[PDB]
């Protein structure tokens, strides 16, 4: 189940059109170390649970209808839920193949179920605007639907945010950077790496980069686009650098920008201007780190932490939600 | 990386290298007192001590220590870095002192018996005798208060440490040579490989063990130094856990995480840590005295999801604990 | 690499760079006098001086040349190279002064114009007045006796030159920047692509005529500066063939080679070489005076076999022919 | 036709198994661009005598029989030569592809076709050793029927030697060796360059070369074997180096040995020992060559030179025509 990233399962579809049937956790009740939402793709071609709903997955596809199979998790060997099994037909196959797309793009993807009382998908919608939305989505403005959904006699719907590829952007190609690009690779990061030293690039010393752009930060700025949700690390080491690419993201509406060194440092590069909202300086968790090694898991650490706090703030569309 | 990763690299390519060590700090830096790093005649280096431009300015010094053969301090202001870059220097405001050391064939043979004493799990007390000048006058490694090796010539290199200035007469340096943190994990499910990486990465020795032989093939776990399978209760009798280990319950099976916490709950140990909701974990106990370093739920709470991050939150942890914890808790503090 | 090649490498990436001149040699080197090099901020070179670890010492002095914004001279003692390496040094019994300029925005400025005036095919006189300590003084490029640019305040820098000690006062320094040689080859058969790439690879402007429109495919001749594809007759009408120019007949069709040949005999060139036996180049000459600078069979006699080989034996020709002719042939010969 | 290297051909074969007829130009009378021996393929899917070979090359593969055509040469456009057209069935299609792992194996061949007065071929061997032959040969010792040729009444005999990949082995992997790699791949050299830092030894500055051996002189010369046909080009610009590896390479049988330097450097490598027999310092023809570019051609010239000129020895199979 919970060991493939949203991003990474909707891959999978594209690079298939093999007989597949998805199941998603639709409910649960009690203890369970699978959280609501959590998803998982049947091949129609380890555990007790997972071996049943291979049956049951089975029996969608052959009856290209969706079912929710409920499991009575109370066992002294941890082994309620509701699991909701969804045939990849060619329409369902078709709208999530438009999910990844959006999810490449950088942005995300509101996804709503109206389920049956017996727990048939009635309907289902992948919302991006107030007014964009696609999938198989009959009635009304599916937004509309789900702000007037009522408190206790509406309980029959799934939602779920499909979030893009976090970038992180990386000012510096030392040998202290090889760990971060490791450690924020495997955790799922879209990760940039910029240096102006070609020999520090060379692609053996960062083989989980997704980009290595060698150039002068000036240049990259000017070149490569930076969004406002991107996650800006600058570890040069070199203090007209770091003051080069800092000065350009000062006005820039940005989410994180760290910078390796102390506060004394960065309020040196800063003389004369005005401090940016998400500075974070030193950069990592304070836990004493020592080394590239730790200092990465320090650095990584406090992006999960803010990517995790501020998703209690429901940032991507809790503006549809208000007014 | 590691001193016994640092150590075995001169195990291998036999070729000349100086070694450098930051014997003292002054302000800010990026590593610390006892940091090193190797200079290689390959070009290529081993370690890093700032990351800027000081390491061009070694790369110079090394070369001449290696043609004289005669170690050499250097002292760097890191802040008046202008006098060593293409821009405005470094940036940070520290004065870092660099000792420099040609691995001479006695130093080799030295190095190579101090990697086979940390493979043996024995640490190693290293002392420097330092001139005025900055040079290496005497050096020794320490196993006991009458069991030392190296080039040491003067009297027991034990009692000539305890009689110094005060807190370090300027021409001593002191290190310990010590063998890698043992991490031993119970349970083999997709969720410990991540976890096995990111530890082995910081300088973990990993042990993974499992009564599931498929779960605990080599390609799923190949940075683990050890791959046990078999019932905990038969790896609890067979396998010696010692007190300075970190122990990680991740089974996903309650009677089996329940065997494991209740044979450790009286073993003094560094670290007990159960993935889990501390309601698990006092069923767990079912009223029982908690270990006193009992981490539940484990790694610092950063609100991870997916078994990528709770092994970021768990290394952090870890790596949070050994830093905080007490630096008077040295294997050779006995000795004074 | 080339003079135009070199300027070329200024006027794009824009960054620090610190200009390395060899401006005098005694004894045995890998370059001559007059060969330069770039130190560039980004740890790339652009050229070669040595080869040996003489290049790492440079990067340091034009690191604190760029930061000083102040030139300096250099004195390398080849020889006594062990105090440069982690070996016995370069070996080469020489010893090589050079020069290094920072490329400041006033310099970059000029060496610009120094390019575009070789784009245009015009060849720029260089001349620099050094200090005592080595610095520099003044510098200009000169285009005529009364048209030159650059920092140069004193005089007429033809005149200060002409009015110099003897055989040059050691504190000046001479260099000519000329636009590259032009090889013009007569036919695009499979045979060509090889001397086109050699050719060059070797510093030469290539320009390929065929009348056939299929074997004259840009992917082809992708190294040739210009393909024009047209017959003989008509090429040699339109285009200009100046007598500085390298002129290659090797269409392997009589008749064309023969219009070719019987054009070029009492135009003034530097080189006509035919592919083929002096008995083909007399039946194509029928019984003519032959050019001064005919070549048949073409290449050095290495006793080549197919088209590689054949393609080495002409450039080893057109660099033997272009080092040996008498150095007292420059563009600027006229001013002395 | 002559454009392709004899491996180069061969090679073609082994990645085929397409219907395929082999030309080769087995007799010149007077004046040809194209030498005797040159060959090409035609393949059953630029010049007016490839475009008559190529409907020869048809009916030949459809009769599955040789032919000789004979082509009056005589045009003053330069449009006698003797064309011999064999199938390359499924025979010899066998045979040359173990020709091809001999000079793989860096092992020469001698081919030998017996012909016919019509010219037709009846016999053909390839050579290796004095009893070590392979082919569709019948009678005798190929060797033996070779060397008792009448020297008029026996010209119906067509010889050819299939030489190895040449090697180019480089010490050295400065700025000044990737002209040298280019020049020497392109003439036909099989490059191996070998350098002890990692950092001058990336694949982007030497694309043409065969292996890239990252190693110290003396690991290099302990663990690849140095065979004694094979080209040494010393060029580290460190004296040690050059001195660590020409130490080696003294009694060690070798064809070239060639350092960059002067003879008096060389003198000095030497000190306290006896040359080796193929020495060459300085190294290439003497053209005054100034820079990389022009002393890597001066280099493959001089290579070039003696490949050639000892090739008027009939160095790889004169030893079976002597006794
Ligand atoms: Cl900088
Ligand atoms: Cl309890
Ligand atoms: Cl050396
Ligand atoms: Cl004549």
Same mark, same amino acid.
């Given at each position: 189940?919970?060991?493939?990233?949203?991003?990474?399962?909707?891959?999978?579809?594209?690079?298939?059109?093999?007989?597949?049937?998805?199941?998603?956790?639709?409910?649960?009740?009690?203890?369970?170390?699978?959280?609501?939402?959590?998803?998982?793709?049947?091949?129609?071609?380890?555990?007790?649970?997972?071996?049943?709903?291979?049956?049951?997955?089975?029996?969608?596809?052959?009856?290209?209808?969706?079912?929710?199979?409920?499991?009575?998790?109370?066992?002294?060997?941890?082994?309620?839920?509701?699991?909701?099994?969804?045939?990849?037909?060619?329409? %369902? !196959?078709?709208? &999530?193949? #438009?999910?990844? +797309?959006?999810?490449?793009?950088?942005?995300?993807? $509101?996804?709503?179920?109206?389920?049956?009382?017996?727990?048939?998908?009635?309907?289902?919608?992948?919302?991006?605007?107030?007014?964009?939305?696609?999938?198989?989505?009959?009635?009304?403005?599916?937004?509309?639907?789900?702000?007037?959904?009522?408190?206790?006699?509406?309980?029959?719907?799934?939602?779920?945010?499909?979030?893009?590829?976090?970038?992180?952007?990386?000012?510096?190609?030392?040998?202290?950077?090889?760990?971060?690009?490791?450690?924020?690779?495997?955790?799922?990061?879209?990760?940039?790496?910029?240096?102006?030293?070609?020999?520090?690039?060379?692609?053996?010393?960062?083989?989980?980069?997704?980009?290595?752009?060698?150039?002068?930060?000036?240049?990259? %700025? !000017?070149?490569? &686009?930076? #969004?406002?949700? +991107?996650?800006?690390?600058?570890?040069?080491?070199? $203090?007209?650098?770091?003051?080069?690419?800092?000065?350009?993201?000062?006005?820039?509406?940005?989410?994180?920008?760290?910078?390796?060194?102390?506060?004394?440092?960065?309020?040196?590069?800063?003389?004369?201007?005005?401090?940016?909202?998400?500075?974070?300086?030193?950069?990592?968790?304070?836990?004493?780190?020592?080394?590239?090694?730790?200092?990465?898991?320090?650095?990584?650490?406090?992006?999960?932490?803010?990517?995790?706090?501020?998703?209690?703030?429901?940032?991507?569309?809790?503006?549809?939600?208000?007014?």
């Amino acid at each position: 189940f919970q060991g493939m990233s949203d991003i990474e399962l909707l891959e999978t579809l594209a690079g298939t059109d093999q007989p597949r049937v998805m199941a998603t956790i639709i409910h649960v009740e009690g203890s369970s170390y699978r959280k609501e939402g959590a998803m998982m793709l049947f091949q129609e071609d380890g555990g007790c649970l997972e071996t049943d709903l291979t049956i049951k997955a089975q029996k969608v596809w052959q009856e290209q209808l969706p079912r929710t199979v409920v499991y009575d998790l109370s066992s002294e060997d941890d082994l309620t839920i509701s699991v909701l099994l969804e045939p990849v037909d060619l329409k %369902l !196959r078709q709208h &999530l193949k #438009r999910v990844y +797309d959006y999810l490449c793009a950088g942005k995300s993807v $509101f996804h709503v179920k109206k389920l049956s009382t017996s727990g048939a998908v009635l309907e289902y919608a992948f919302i991006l605007d107030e007014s964009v939305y696609f999938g198989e989505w009959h009635s009304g403005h599916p937004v509309e639907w789900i702000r007037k959904i009522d408190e206790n006699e509406e309980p029959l719907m799934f939602t779920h945010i499909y979030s893009p590829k976090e970038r992180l952007i990386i000012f510096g190609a030392g040998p202290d950077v090889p760990p971060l690009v490791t450690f924020a690779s495997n955790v799922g990061f879209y990760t940039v790496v910029t240096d102006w030293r070609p020999n520090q690039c060379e692609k053996h010393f960062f083989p989980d980069a997704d980009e290595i752009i060698v150039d002068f930060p000036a240049d990259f %700025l !000017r070149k490569f &686009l930076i #969004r406002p949700d +991107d996650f800006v690390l600058i570890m040069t080491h070199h $203090f007209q650098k770091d003051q080069e690419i800092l000065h350009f993201l000062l006005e820039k509406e940005l989410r994180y920008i760290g910078i390796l060194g102390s506060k004394e440092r960065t309020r040196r590069l800063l003389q004369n201007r005005k401090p940016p909202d998400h500075l974070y300086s030193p950069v990592g968790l304070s836990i004493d780190a020592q080394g590239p090694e730790e200092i990465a898991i320090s650095i990584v650490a406090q992006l999960i932490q803010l990517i995790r706090s501020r998703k209690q703030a429901s940032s991507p569309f809790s503006y549809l939600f208000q007014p």
